[PDB]
């Protein structure tokens, strides 16, 4: 007796998927769509090495903390890597003004060319070679930030400084400077002679006048003094004009912003890994064609979409 | 139907014929084609709809910007929870549809054989059909072909 | 079913009778009324669900507020992408459910004619029935009416 | 002999998408996405917007001489400002908490400008030479209309002590500034006194500004700087100004007459002599659709915005 | 089927037999056990899926922080709208499935008896079958038993 | 004879909603939304909240005489402040970074107040004359308890130099202020020195304040102002104060003894003498529902908030 029947594919695939009203349901085929594995290291991003700051912070890098000499004139980078709590920061204690806003600009920048805008030899009526502190050691001795100069009085006098610099470059220029807050009236005249001092800084947008704040402070890295640092972007054809009769930590070097583009500041404890990748997270690089991953929320490059799912599998075949 | 057939590794849906000549399986290519397209359309459509998903960005705040630091945190976690929800919820719902979609194509294929031979064959109930005449291998292919 | 009838311009679902008297189309208002109410309840329910949707608002920041401006921009685009996703997804989902809804109403209506005349009519296969007795226009209306 | 079940079909060719099928032809379908705008700035429900043309908000409120068109404007539905307005602060400087003031202003529909300190009330100071080549007007040097740049009179600048008590029923937007000179010589030349201050106080405000001498790049030909401030003076509150130099004093202030829904639109369009229920910076919308993809920033009774290129619901069947 | 039976208070789905011995209702415990589990799984799945929902937090802002105050307000209300939408739409969609799921189980239970009694029974049309032979209570148990 | 298939029915009347059907009667419904609350403020898992009554956070911390209920409060689970507390800064002024302090306070469950600078330790200054009619108490002039308003003694106000070292293991919340007088005459009458400053330093803090002497509007009968500041003094750090006038010195500081999840709620409600696992500003919630629509500001183990008026899951069949 002749016959024909309708049936379907079955096999020994134990692989399971979930649905709205049915957990752990076995199917003949199932497509995983989530990537859970990473290579565990920090890589070049499509052939461009990152700037690994090791034990230095951004502030320590840019101001020129003596411990940070590896980073004096760094090459172009894809991303920047910094530790969560870096050792080499403001060696002389104090603060970096508008620091996180500076950092935010830095995540859109891929390369600096550091240039000398005020020579250390150019200070003829001030002492420019003794601005050092045991707070900033270098090879067993007192030193200081490399890109700014702590000037003091010369021959019991501090003449009023008037310096200008016109940015005759085609690029934007990050310019840094600071002020020293001394411990007391005696320190003030010992270092700068004049008891009442200021620092004027103007550009086309900046109109700044700083006065030192004397107070009695706890020792940080052996110092009760403080330095407060500032910055601005000096546009092509604008000029920055400094004036001061004391407490001025003057610019020596500044930074031409030579490459802008996609970048970021990752927090990571990892060191460089000698690998290349299309996708970096702070905890590992990723090499995948999956649409989703669950490694880390913060990534850069050609990456899949992050989810917090532990598991994500699509049903493809029939029930089994 | 009791269950699936392991003896058919040719495709997802098909037929098993029993004949004076012989007996063996045969996959339905027109019906399998429609399913591979409908599944491949779905999986790709899930990926493309999700590529507009939120991308988090590291933002740094100082110790007197705690409120906005928290706000920033809430906002980014918020979006990642939403999109995680959307990814999971879509997968669960898509799996339900995909399993029920394969079911539908077995019912519809069973009806086509019931319709193609209505009065020349009796339905048994277990997913089969007994001919009331002799159907040789060319005839059996005709039932698989569609022209009959 | 082979396909749709262009001849019918009365309603969505209906009958085409052939008779010794004559032959013509006739829409089932009972099933059609149910479909119009259903579809209209869906489209309005979709509009009114998307009433509670995010509104973008111009905020401005100076050039030392770049962090919060970016946070603002990402959160507004974030919600827009979410709601864009929701609108497009719900439409694709409702469209599929709507096409299957019209298929269901043809199966549900075909079974109603098969059950109404069980022993007094044969089933063909292409969405038709053959009477074993004479069914005039008033009899045909009785199949369309309900009482039979 | 035969009866059959069937369904509707027409020469439709209209297409829709689903989860597992795309490009599917149907008999009926409803578009729910508006994609068109009239491409112009209109009145919003019969109320004309404030179109600042080439003026910024600051240029308008301070009274930049190029912005005389807006000295006393009528009630508005919304404000339109260009991305980079040419007439901003003619004498260079800054507006303190400018973005916050713009925020307040998005909740305001109408001011009534009033005089509060006449130019002629200044007996012991020169109130009529406060001008600059940076603020031209009709061939000459001028200045912001709503504030007064006071300088010394007969080689003296007595200490100003002036109150204004808001005796009005309305909240009052008061504006003032401070002049930042180029050098000490300039300071004594305009104000006599070398060391100056501006104290300002209300019931909430307690401010003390000191001028900041620096060497600056010339902007609009000036190396000097004006820095402006503002406050909302409540009914029955008073504002007290004390100063011995560098004071840019209030002349006109703004009574807040109507609050309600508004916004500041960034747009390069001009007035389009039209009315609409719904405006974007790119053009107006007149639609009964639930969605649109014209622009995210709208005002009025608008549909909800999405980023979709296309949104069409199925209603009928396949073809 | 015309409608439901108030007489059957045993389970959700079942049979009403008519017989020479007697007549009464009988709930199918095989299909009712499957429906109780499917419903309990769906309600608990909805509760767990929404367990990662946004949580508004109180934040205070001063008079000159209106912009961020407004940002905060819209962000929180933005998330609360999204999760409200998510919750309501999921109930409506689950309800639709739940009602059709009950219809599905009636159709499948109907075909099981039609399949179990094919040649020795006639189908009526209103959800009933007519035996061509004598089916006592133990025979009727058999049809319920499967 | 015969057999028939069917399904359960009853007189349920209860309705659910679906994508294309409103009000659909089912035999078994499942509401999953709590709409009810007790309408009071309750203990959170057996810990009572700090109910500040008619006092603000600032009045509590500085020690406003009207807030003596809260001098030394026990551990709390959450804080409750009214929308507009009557007893804020009795002497008018401001609290610097007030919103950021309130945020930190929302991360804290307990303080232990200690005296860090006794009133009797000021040998060359008047400490028990720092009182004001703006801060009454039992019909006589008073002042904040936890800080001290020093004035001149014997027509002299020597330069103050006081350090305090946090020898405790707890972080210490320290509070001080500065007096902004009305005029020169009052300045010398109170402090003798016409030109004054307050220096404050820690390992992180570096502050120099100069009083603003100006004409202001009376608030609580005072044209003067007090401006308060705070810092968190870490274990083993010191805080050093130098001043020749206008100094409102610490007396008491707060040891941060415990931190956890807490919140500052705004509510008009009084204490409810009850206990809950989930509390909103308008009432507590004891429910097993997955959702609720009472209020979005919750603390404790709560359902998930939605704005929805109704959420009804269908479980049974139609009717
Ligand atoms: C001259 C001398 O004895 N120099 C060294 C000692 O200073 C040093 O002991 C440290 O003294 C610190 C303060 O001294 C400095 C410093 O910061 O290191 C010495 C700098 O020459 C001086 N720099 C300038 C430009 O003036 C600097 C400056 O005056 C202040 O930083 C301003 O605030 O002060 C400090 O007290 C440390 O705690 C202490 O160890 C000893 C030990 O290293 O060696 C001496 O060579
Ligand atoms: C010749 C002469 O003595 N004065 C005018 C020229 O200086 C002026 O050329 C412009 O001068 C600018 C600065 O001059 C002003 C100004 O801003 O226009 C002149 C104003 O009278 C003066 N206002 C007051 C109240 O004193 C103003 C003020 O002192 C400063 O702005 C304070 O910062 O300065 C500047 O140098 C430009 O580069 C230049 O174009 C000519 C215009 O041709 O008119 C002369 O009367
Ligand atoms: C510490 C001290 O001596 N406080 C004075 C105080 C100060 O001189 C002043 O507040 C500093 O800004 O002034 C007090 O008198 C002013 C007060 O007098 C009341 O009678 C009246 O109700 C108020 O309107 C006002 O005139 C004060 O009470 O604050 C006296 C106090 O001794
Ligand atoms: C800087 O130099 C350019 C070229 O000489 C000049 O045009 C410009 O005015 C200068 N900028 C300033 C601010 O002086
Ligand atoms: C302002 O004037 C009114 C009416 O004269 C008066 O009552 C009020 O106290 C004044 N306000 C101030 C702050 O002086
Ligand atoms: C505070 O006191 C401790 C114990 O005497 C001491 O070790 C520490 O250095 C002091 N800290 C400061 C900042 O003075």
What structural keywords apply?
heterohexamer; A: 320 residues; mainly beta; Hemagglutinin, Chain A, domain 2; Hemagglutinin (Ha1 Chain), Chain: A, domain 1; 2 domains; seven-stranded mixed sheet; four-stranded antiparallel sheet; 37% strand; B: 148 residues; alpha+beta; Hemagglutinin Ectodomain, Chain B; two-stranded antiparallel sheet; two-stranded antiparallel ribbon; 3 helices; 55% helix; rod-shaped; binds a molecule of 3 linked components (NAG-GAL-SIA); binds a molecule of 2 linked components (GAL-SIA); binds 2-acetamido-2-deoxy-beta-D-glucopyranose; viral protein; N-glycosylation; virus receptor
Largest β-sheet summary of chain A: 7 strands, mixed
The molecules bound to the chains, other than polymers, are: a molecule of 3 linked components (NAG-GAL-SIA), a molecule of 2 linked components (GAL-SIA), 2-acetamido-2-deoxy-beta-D-glucopyranose
Structural class of chain A: mainly beta
Radius of gyration of chain B: 26 Å
Q: How would you spell out the order of helices and strands of chain B?
A: EEHHEEH
Might you state the CATH topology name of the largest domain in chain A? Hemagglutinin (Ha1 Chain), Chain: A, domain 1
- What is the helix fraction of residues of chain A, given as a range? under 10%
What is the CATH fold-level name of chain B? Hemagglutinin Ectodomain, Chain B
Please write the CATH class name of chain B: Alpha Beta
Whole-Å distance between the termini of chain A?
30 Å
Total strands of chain B: 4
CATH architecture identity of chain B: Alpha-Beta Complex
User: Biggest interface and its residues per chain?
Assistant: A-B, 51 and 64 residues
CATH architecture field of the largest domain in chain A: Alpha-Beta Complex
PDB class: viral protein
Keywords: viral protein, N-glycosylation, virus receptor, bird FLU
Assembly: hexameric
Entry title: H5 (tyTy) Influenza Virus Haemagglutinin in Complex with Human Receptor Analogue 6'-SLN
């Amino acid at each position: 007796p002749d016959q024909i029947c309708i049936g379907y594919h079955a096999n020994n695939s134990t692989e399971q998927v979930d649905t709205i009203m049915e957990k752990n349901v076995t199917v003949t085929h199932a497509q995983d769509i989530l990537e859970k594995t990473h290579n565990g290291k920090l890589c070049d991003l499509d052939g461009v090495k990152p700037l690994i700051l090791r034990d230095c912070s951004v502030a320590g890098w840019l101001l020129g903390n003596p411990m940070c000499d590896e980073f004096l004139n760094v090459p172009e980078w894809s991303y920047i890597v910094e530790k969560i709590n870096p050792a080499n920061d403001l060696c002389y204690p104090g603060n970096f003004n508008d620091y996180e806003e500076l950092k935010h600009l830095l995540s859109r920048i891929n390369h600096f060319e550091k240039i000398q805008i005020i020579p250390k030899s150019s200070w003829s009526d001030h002492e420019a070679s003794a601005g050092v502190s045991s707070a900033c050691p270098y090879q067993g001795r007192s030193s200081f930030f490399r890109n700014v100069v702590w000037l003091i009085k010369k021959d019991n006098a501090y003449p009023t400084i008037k310096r200008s610099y016109n940015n005759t470059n085609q690029e934007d220029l990050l310019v840094l400077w600071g002020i020293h807050h001394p411990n007391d009236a005696a320190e003030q005249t010992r270092l700068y002679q004049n008891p009442t001092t200021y620092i004027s800084v103007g550009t086309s947008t900046l109109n700044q006048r700083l006065v030192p704040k004397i107070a009695t402070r706890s020792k940080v890295n052996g110092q009760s003094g403080r330095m407060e640092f500032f910055w601005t972007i000096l546009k092509p054809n604008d000029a920055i004009n400094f004036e001061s009769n004391g407490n001025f930590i003057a610019p020596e070097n500044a930074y031409k912003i030579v490459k802008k583009g996609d970048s970021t500041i990752m927090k990571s404890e990892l060191e460089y890994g000698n690998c290349n990748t299309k996708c970096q997270t702070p905890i590992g690089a990723i090499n995948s064609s999956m649409p989703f991953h669950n490694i880390h929320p913060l990534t850069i490059g050609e990456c899949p979409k992050y989810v917090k799912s532990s598991r994500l599998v699509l049903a493809t075949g029939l029930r089994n | 139907i009791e269950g699936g057939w392991q003896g058919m590794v040719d495709g997802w849906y098909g037929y098993h014929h029993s004949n004076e000549q012989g007996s063996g399986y045969a996959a339905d290519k027109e019906s399998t084609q429609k399913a591979i397209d409908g599944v491949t359309n779905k999986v790709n459509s899930i990926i493309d709809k999700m590529n507009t998903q939120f991308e988090a960005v590291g933002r740094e705040f100082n110790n007197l910007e705690r409120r906005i630091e928290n706000l920033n945190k809430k906002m980014e976690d918020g979006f990642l929870d939403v999109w995680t929800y959307n990814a999971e919820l879509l997968v669960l719902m898509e799996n339900e549809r995909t399993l029920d979609f394969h079911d539908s194509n077995v019912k519809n294929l069973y009806d086509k054989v019931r319709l193609q031979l209505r009065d020349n064959a009796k339905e048994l109930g277990n997913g089969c059909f007994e001919f009331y005449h002799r159907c040789d291998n060319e005839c059996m292919e005709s039932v698989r072909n569609g022209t009959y």
